[PDB]
From a paper:
Human leukocyte antigen class-I ([name]-I) molecules are responsible for presenting endogenous peptides mainly generated by proteolytic machinery on the surfaces of cytotoxic [name]+ T lymphocytes. In particular, peptide binds to pocket-B and pocket-F with the help of anchor residues P2 and PΩ, respectively. We employed a well characterized [name]*11:01-EBV restricted peptide ATIGTAMYK derived from BRLF1 protein product Rta (134–142)28 to investigate the stability of [name]*11:01 molecule in complex with shorter peptides (<8-mer). To elucidate the structural basis for the two short peptides occupying the same peptide binding groove, the crystal structure of [name]*11:01 in complex with two short peptides, namely ATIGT (5-mer) and AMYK (4-mer) was determined at 1.66 Å, and was compared with the structure of [name]*11:01 in complex with the 9-mer full-length ATIGTAMYK peptide resolved at 1.35 Å.
Author numbering:
A (entry chain C): 1 to 5
B (entry chain A): 1 to 274
C (entry chain B): 1 to 99
D (entry chain D): 1 to 4
The structure:
């Protein structure tokens, strides 16, 4: 899961 | 049995031909599992490994959000950097970002990364302490001062030591059957005369995972590079890798040469001889 | 900075006439990312060619895999044609199935 | 918020 959350 | 998760983002301006193009890909070790392409019709983060497909709508929505946001951020940053470098509006330029985390066999955090490039050269990078930045040039020092004022290193650290690691663990469990597998190389040799006095020997490794491998030619038990060619390790297209190493030898002296194959999936390194 | 592509054209499996396989063209180590790669059968561009999602290496250079299902025969010649700003003319690499 |  990508950064941003 | 250390493992990594990495995301790779590319933004490329294309002045007079629409908005910049943005591509994102994610990997666990040497296995891709997601993609996004700003030019594709879906405008969604899309699965590319079977073990991610079980993730629910919330996951896909959130991942799509995050990469869309980065694409838009990069559109601003491309303009900014063209200004820092005093470049014209007519040239294409590229921003690249890589980030991610490594875990140990225990599943515990080992290391995090975030590094950024401009036109294929280092621009700024998070240091290994996850608290400070290294700027490659005077333009990136401008960014560095902003990012210190913004406390950006703390937000990166929180992700890299947190969410990054947690999700890498989840994927390692969910995709265990394929991610935690090693597939040793299947090896063979080829042999071709090239003149009345030389012949080529080529040592092949096929079907292996993960990609890391070493192939070395020796003559009389000594590693050699004279008259050798080693290709880049390359994808088979089925999730495994391939590599070969070749040596030109004096005709009749093939038996003096050995190819040594090292790979995590092998019980012991292989020695091949024609 | 520009970096020219390293180009390899190869089959997924060792080739056997009449047996279905995949023809690959792997381009790596290039910059900038704009590139055009075609697979050729007897000099003609193959229509159904797919490619991987753009990614890059530790030195920021790019890589891509282009690929198509095929069945090799004795008489059909295959090649990959790579068009990149670093190449004055497209580079055409012939498939050598006996390497 | 992180802008270059």
């Amino acid at each position: 899961a990508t950064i941003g959350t | 049995g250390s493992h990594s998760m990495r995301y790779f983002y590319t933004s490329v301006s294309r002045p007079g031909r629409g908005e910049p193009r943005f591509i994102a890909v994610g990997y666990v070790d040497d296995t891709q599992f997601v993609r996004f392409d700003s030019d594709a019709a879906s405008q969604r983060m899309e699965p590319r490994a079977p073990w991610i497909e079980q993730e629910g709508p919330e996951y896909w929505d959130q991942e799509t959000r995050n990469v869309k946001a980065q694409s838009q951020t990069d559109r601003v940053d491309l303009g900014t950097l063209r200004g820092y470098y005093n470049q014209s509006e007519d040239g294409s330029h590229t921003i690249q970002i890589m980030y991610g985390c490594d875990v140990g066999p225990d599943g515990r955090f080992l290391r995090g990364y975030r590094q950024d490039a401009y036109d294929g050269k280092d621009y700024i990078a998070l240091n290994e302490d996850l608290r400070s930045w290294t700027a490659a040039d005077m333009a990136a020092q401008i960014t560095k001062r902003k990012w210190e004022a913004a406390h950006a290193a703390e937000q990166q650290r929180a992700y890299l030591e947190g969410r990054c690691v947690e999700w890498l663990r989840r994927y390692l469990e969910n995709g265990k059957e394929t991610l935690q597998r090693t597939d040793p190389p299947k090896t063979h040799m080829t042999h071709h005369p090239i003149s009345d006095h030389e012949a080529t020997l080529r040592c092949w490794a096929l079907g292996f995972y993960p990609a890391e491998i070493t192939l070395t030619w020796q003559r009389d038990g000594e590693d050699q590079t004279q008259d050798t060619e080693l290709v880049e390790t390359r994808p088979a297209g089925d999730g495994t890798f391939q590599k070969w190493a070749a040596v030109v030898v004096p005709s009749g002296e093939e038996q003096r040469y050995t190819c040594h194959v090292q790979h995590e999936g092998l019980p012991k390194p292989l020695t091949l001889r024609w | 900075i520009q970096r020219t592509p390293k180009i390899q054209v190869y089959s997924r499996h060792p080739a056997e006439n009449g047996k279905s396989n995949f023809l690959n063209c792997y381009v790596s180590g290039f910059h900038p990312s704009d590139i055009e790669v075609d697979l050729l059968k007897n000099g003609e561009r193959i229509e159904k060619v797919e490619h991987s999602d753009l990614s890059f290496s530790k030195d920021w250079s790019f890589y891509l895999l282009y690929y198509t299902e095929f069945t090799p025969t004795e008489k059909d010649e295959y090649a990959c044609r790579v068009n990149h700003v670093t190449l004055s003319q497209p580079k055409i690499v012939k498939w050598d199935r006996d390497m | 918020a992180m802008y270059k």
